[PDB]
Each structure stands twice: as C-alpha cells, then as structure tokens.
C-alpha cells in the first residue's frame, strides 16, 4: 500500500526522516537494505524518557520460496501483510507500528 515504502533510501536518510520530533512513537517506513542486497528494512521511531528520540532498524529477510520475515517465527507472503501485522501486534518489535513516516 505504497505510502510507507520509501524504496532505495539510505539508513542515514531514513534516520533523518524518522528523527523528525513531530513524529509519534512507532512512526515507520520500509526501505531496501544497504548492507544486505536483496533484503528490506523496517525503520521505526522510538523514545526513552532519559535519552529521547531514537530509531530501531529491523532487517526484513526474504526466503528463496518468496516469503518475508523479521523473525522466522512469523513469516509473510508480502511486505504489505508484514506492515499490517505489526500495526496490530508488536510481537517482538520495540513497539507496534503507529504512524506512516512523513514526506
């Protein structure tokens, strides 16, 4: 569902975009991995009371068969299904996916 997929942007630009102080906790985007070619990344804003704003990066791996997973426990047939699942369930992530990242 497009909006949350920022394609080939870098960890550093995703962090520029996510560290925007206006963004609520759980604001996210999906991008391609720089380090692991053929893999994706789920980038999500978070907050620590003492330290403030920070970004968690989760590698989305792709099986040869076609599926996607952050943890092999929960596999998905598409990235849109992975985003819809973690919007409702944190299930291992730092926080549930709330906002789509701006611009």
């Amino acid at each position: 569902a497009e909006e949350w997929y920022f394609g080939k942007i870098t960890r550093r630009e995703s962090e520029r975009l996510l560290l925007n102080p206006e963004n609520p906790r759980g604001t996210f985007l999906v991008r391609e991995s720089e380090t692991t070619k053929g893999a994706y990344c789920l980038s999500v804003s978070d907050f620590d009371n003492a330290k403030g704003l920070n970004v968690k990066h989760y590698k989305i791996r792709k099986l040869d068969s076609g599926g996607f997973y952050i943890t092999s426990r929960t596999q998905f047939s598409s990235l849109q299904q992975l985003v819809a699942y973690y919007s409702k369930h944190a299930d291992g992530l730092c926080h549930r996916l709330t906002n789509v990242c701006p611009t």
């Binding site: 990344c41 968690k56 990066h57 989760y58 590698k59 943890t71 092999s72 291992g92 992530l93």
Partner: peptide, 5 residues
C-alpha cells in the same frame, strides 16, 4: 539491526 525473538 536489532535481534528479535
């Protein structure tokens, strides 16, 4: 990247 599960 973080460790999960």
């Amino acid at each position: 990247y973080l460790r999960v599960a």
